[PDB]
Design a protein around this ligand. Structure first.
Ligand SMILES: [Mg+2]
Ligand SMILES: [Mg+2]
Length: 430
DNA sequence: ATTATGACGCT
DNA sequence: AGCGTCATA
């Protein structure tokens, strides 16, 4: 009763830029705005691979991972923007720099954890306390929440989308004002006010739109974010969790979209997150291990404690290129040349990093894949990284991998290499 | 022949 | 340390 913790101590948001690489290209090229548009890398093989898709194009069935030639079959008028190529490979610098624009704006409001190139968790707990003070018990007006959905409302005893949104928001705010909700619900609401402000500042100062989730932890905030896209934000309250989870496929929850989630479904014979509540913590630990079991037991109740880490910068800076099909690297100098290409981009990004962020990478990570091997990495070896010099890094990389070559002939490379990867890690303050 | 990333867990 | 998992544009 009085001692059951409810995972309602924090306010956490997850902000995710809508179709981010597409918005970066649309800001640069006004001709692409408000059109079915996608971003593609390379062009020769089947028109290139799509890596981002505008919501106008999604309506035609265009998706990420699709070949541009195939996307054009679904959407003949699809417009395309190409990822820059430098030194023979895709170069994502424009999007990394746009990401920094957005992350720096978010950081004015609160501590953020960079979760990917286009999304960040926000810990709003302190900001909410301060805003609550500034307020002096004044009601929160719907006008402060013009793009917010309250998940699960309206309910109980209009056929337009925006009308539905406001109906639910009014029920929520009516109940908050009447004192029929909880202090955590008030805290979430103020959290949502702050995220409207954050999202307005991002759009004003960059041109970019985003969606966001506001809840009591990272997992719920991420889930919330996806419920109403694009350009909207969603509040998932603790109380909304039983109904939300009762029909929520397990694979939709962050970290359960893969093999673990599949085993939860198979071993337990269930489909929805809410069905997990019927098992004891020990039962879940017996199937999924101590850590995952405890996590599952709390998560299916809407409770999770993973903190928003104070980390706005990436921990690693990496450079990779696949060499698929017949392009697999088969000669020694081929391997050396591409190692150099990679090492040159890496040096460029590392020198920029050292200047911007007052740190130095100390470990060089070399990874390769060989043909018809594994998936992903076949092999991964570390060596020291003492100097930001591309020729040295490339020579060093060759050294740690050169004995992978099973060839008799040292000029030839067998089995052919289908992937090269250089990654700088173990940063120290400098 | 999605590609190019990036974080974290296991042993 | 090296490998595997899960995720994002
Ligand atoms: Mg996303
Ligand atoms: Mg994202």
């Amino acid at each position: 009763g009085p001692h059951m913790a409810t995972g309602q101590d924090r306010v956490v948001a997850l902000v995710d830029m809508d179709c981010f690489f597409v918005q970066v290209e649309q800001r640069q090229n006004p001709h692409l705005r408000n059109k079915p548009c996608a971003v593609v890398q390379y062009k020769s093989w089947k028109g290139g691979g799509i890596i981002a898709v505008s919501y106008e194009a999604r309506a035609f069935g265009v998706t990420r991972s699709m070949w541009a030639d195939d996307a054009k079959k679904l959407c003949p008028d699809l417009l395309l923007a190409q990822v820059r190529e430098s030194r023979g490979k895709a170069n994502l610098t424009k999007y990394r720099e746009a990401s920094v624009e957005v992350m720096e704006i978010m950081s004015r409001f609160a501590v953020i954890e960079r979760a990917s190139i286009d999304e960040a968790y926000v810990d709003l707990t302190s900001a909410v306390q301060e805003r609550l003070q500034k307020l002096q018990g004044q009601p929160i007006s719907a006008d402060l929440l013009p793009s917010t959905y309250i998940e699960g409302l309206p309910q109980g005893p209009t056929v337009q989308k925006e009308g539905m949104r406001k109906q639910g928001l009014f029920q929520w705010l009516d109940s908050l004002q009447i004192d029929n909700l909880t202090s955590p619900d008030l805290q979430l609401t103020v959290g949502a006010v702050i995220v409207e402000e954050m999202r307005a500042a991002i759009e004003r100062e960059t041109g970019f739109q985003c969606s966001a989730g506001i809840s009591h932890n990272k997992v719920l905030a991420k889930l919330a974010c996806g419920l109403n896209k694009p350009n909207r934000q969603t509040l998932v309250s603790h109380g909304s969790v039983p109904q939300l989870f009762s029909q929520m496929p397990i694979r939709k929850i962050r970290s359960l979209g893969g093999k673990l989630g599949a085993s939860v479904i198979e071993i337990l014979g269930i489909e929805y997150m809410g069905e997990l509540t019927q098992f004891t913590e020990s039962q879940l630990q017996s199937h999924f291990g101590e850590k995952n079991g405890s996590w599952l037991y709390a998560m299916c109740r809407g409770i999770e404690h993973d903190p928003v880490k104070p980390r706005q910068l990436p921990k690693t800076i990496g450079c990779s290129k696949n060499f698929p099909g017949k392009t697999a690297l088969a000669t020694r100098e081929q391997v050396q040349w591409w190692l150099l290409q990679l090492a040159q981009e890496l040096e460029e990004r590392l020198t920029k990093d050292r200047n911007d962020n007052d740190r130095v990478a100390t470990q060089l990570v070399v990874s390769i894949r060989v043909q018809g091997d594994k998936r992903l990495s076949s092999l991964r070896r570390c060596c020291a990284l003492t100097r930001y010099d591309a020729h040295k890094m490339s020579h060093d990389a060759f050294t740690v991998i050169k004995n992978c070559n099973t060839s008799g002939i040292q000029t030839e490379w067998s089995p052919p290499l289908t992937m090269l990867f250089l990654c700088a890690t173990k940063f120290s303050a400098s």
